[PDB]
Design a protein around this ligand. Structure first.
Ligand SMILES: Nc1ncnc2c1ncn2[C@@H]1O[C@H](COP(=O)(O)OP(=O)(O)OC[C@H]2O[C@H](O)[C@H](O)[C@@H]2O)[C@@H](O)[C@H]1O
Ligand SMILES: Nc1ncnc2c1ncn2[C@@H]1O[C@H](COP(=O)(O)OP(=O)(O)OC[C@H]2O[C@H](O)[C@H](O)[C@@H]2O)[C@@H](O)[C@H]1O
Ligand SMILES: NC(=O)[C@H]1CCCc2c1[nH]c1ccc(Cl)cc21
Ligand SMILES: NC(=O)[C@H]1CCCc2c1[nH]c1ccc(Cl)cc21
Ligand SMILES: NC(=O)[C@H]1CCCc2c1[nH]c1ccc(Cl)cc21
Ligand SMILES: NC(=O)[C@H]1CCCc2c1[nH]c1ccc(Cl)cc21
Ligand SMILES: [Zn+2]
Ligand SMILES: [Zn+2]
Lengths: 299, 302
């Protein structure tokens, strides 16, 4: 069933202004924060996974892999000390999602990021699913213990160059950011079970959709729900190939003759959000919000 | 409405379903575990699997040897393994001949195989019965997309057993057999058969696979929600809690053991013995045994 009058940004904008479009879910990744100075993972040359050579890893992902971590925790904590102190401000894209909230359209933002820029831009707890966790809290990795530690305790250890250990059981303690091999937060599953039943539009921004189960989210919406991708490159579309991340047919179809609801706007997330905001008549409103908020942070 | 087709979640329940009028079309989903009893190692069995046995090639990770990007940078390890695996002949197993019985009883809609050993064909399945999902070593191709010149089996055998890394005659790019590496497209037949077959499948028989690679792993989720799915395998496969980096799409797995289980059965053991057990329940045990004896004797005839 086809709800967009045309498969373009303009078509998505007209749909957003129709009575049909009440509930919008944003699905976001590291691409929405590169313009703020935080590298992504998988972009050639600049991405984090192309810049870990000094840690002497078997493959880049090992630095956030739970089995490797337990055996060799030192690289992760060395990287954490290098990355933690960074100070960053939300992007136009983050403020666009804030505007969706204030306009009453945002059902939920599911984020793969741990930078907290969604919260800094003014989205609240109930608007967010921090799918790949948070550094705000930390836990002992032992399943029979799971002692919780606050951010202050973790910083005390990290910047003291002591490998954080649990005071009860001496097991490693790590921030609640989700590693390969680890469970996702309970909130991911409880929100996912209900949010996708009546969603009217998916807005996918700044992600390569290369990790499960987050990549499955696009297939959870009803088949009639349009999906707009704002990203530098097409993501989620391919023929069947061995080792593909998406389930069979769970991807996007922007370009086949059977394409009916997916739109790819290729370019920078910030510029896509500006372009869409203009089509919605919100451009002036977004720009002021950005300027005031960036000014407020500088103070 | 959820149609509960199995009267109990057991091999016995599955056999009763198979004998009913409701079970007309079976799809078999198979992997390397159906050929280990013939002498061919699997991939992911601890210690014995191929991926725990590649140390001498000093690969970055085991899957690199069957990965197209790595291959293009370092093709020698693949061909050095291909020398170690191209020789030797194998006979089909009881499990292969069980699939042959399904064919000859008009029950086999399709066998989707991740194997390149061709044992399904040697067991008497014909081309139309089969989706060789991960390719064939019978044909080869230049890796350059603009070229893609095809080369026959003899050409590839000539090059590999000359210990020369095969290059394309039209463009000098690497040539490899049409077995599917990580990063490579599956044959178009895979998708075309899947879209049709999975609309009309009455039972999935999943044997000898860990379901750890996509898109093959997705096939279980393409069956109608009521279609029972029987796993015959050493270990449970396709049933796990979600985690970051999981292979299956969310909700796309087997459910043998939860409070909501209604159609998935795991029979844990060797595929040959599981097929014998099932055949005995169906009244086919002697027929199967006779078939295996006959066909093996015939192969030994030359
Ligand atoms: N300014 C920009 N505008 C538009 N697109 C951009 C921009 N910057 C980057 N991109 C695109 O943005 C995308 C960034 O893709 P990836 O780097 O894979 O990050 P993820 O968040 O999806 O990684 C997911 C998980 O993987 C990790 O293991 C962690 O667990 C992560 O949480 C690319 O398509 C870029 O082209
Ligand atoms: N005799 C046996 N009986 C029953 N189960 C067995 C037996 N032998 C092994 N097993 C089980 O059989 C399963 C073997 O699983 P895997 O070794 O992953 O092989 P695949 O075919 O799924 O590999 C898929 C692709 O991955 C590669 O990259 C290639 O591309 C492959 O085509 C395990 O669960 C064993 O416990
Ligand atoms: N610095 C920040 O505002 C954020 C920015 C995103 C990356 C990041 C932050 N905090 C971290 C703590 C530990 C580890 Cl391993 C990574 C990070
Ligand atoms: N901008 C971000 O927050 C991205 C990029 C900074 C490192 C990071 C991000 N997402 C993550 C999810 C899990 C883990 Cl372990 C680390 C990260
Ligand atoms: N030997 C056989 O009948 C088959 C048996 C399965 C493994 C195998 C065969 N042929 C091959 C050609 C190349 C590579 Cl890399 C592997 C194989
Ligand atoms: N029994 C088999 O055919 C298995 C085990 C032998 C090597 C092998 C099998 N399946 C494959 C699929 C792709 C590639 Cl590149 C290699 C193989
Ligand atoms: Zn503890
Ligand atoms: Zn060529």
């Amino acid at each position: 069933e086809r709800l967009l009058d045309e498969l373009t940004l303009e078509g998505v904008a007209r749909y957003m202004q129709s009575e049909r479009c009440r509930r919008v879910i944003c699905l976001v990744g590291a691409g929405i924060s590169t313009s703020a100075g935080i590298p992504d993972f998988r972009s050639p040359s600049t991405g984090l996974y192309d810049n870990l050579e000094k840690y002497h890893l078997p493959y880049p992902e090992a630095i956030f892999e739970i089995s490797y971590f337990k055996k060799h925790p030192e690289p992760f904590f060395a990287l954490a000390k290098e990355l933690y102190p960074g100070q960053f401000k939300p992007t136009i894209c983050h403020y666009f999602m804030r505007l969706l909230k204030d306009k009453g359209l945002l059902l939920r933002c599911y984020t793969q990021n741990i930078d907290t820029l969604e919260r800094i831009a003014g989205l609240e707890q109930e608007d967010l699913v921090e799918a790949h966790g948070t550094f705000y809290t930390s836990h002992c990795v032992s399943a029979s213990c799971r002692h919780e530690y606050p951010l202050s305790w973790m910083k005390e250890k990290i910047f003291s160059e002591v490998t954080p250990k649990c005071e009860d059981c001496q097991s490693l303690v790590k921030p609640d950011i989700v590693f390969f091999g680890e469970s996702l937060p309970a909130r991911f599953f409880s929100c996912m079970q209900s949010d996708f039943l009546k969603v009217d539009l998916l807005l996918v921004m700044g992600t390569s959709l290369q990790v499960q189960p987050f990549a499955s989210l696009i297939s959870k919406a009803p088949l009639s729900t349009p999906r707009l991708l704002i990203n530098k490159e097409k993501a989620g579309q391919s023929d069947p190939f061995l080792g593909m991340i998406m389930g069979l047919g769970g991807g996007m179809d922007f370009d086949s003759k059977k394409a009916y609801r997916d739109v790819a706007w290729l370019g920078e997330c910030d510029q896509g959000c500006l372009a869409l905001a203009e089509l919605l008549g919100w451009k002036k409103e977004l720009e002021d919000l950005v300027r005031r908020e960036h000014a407020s942070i500088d103070a």
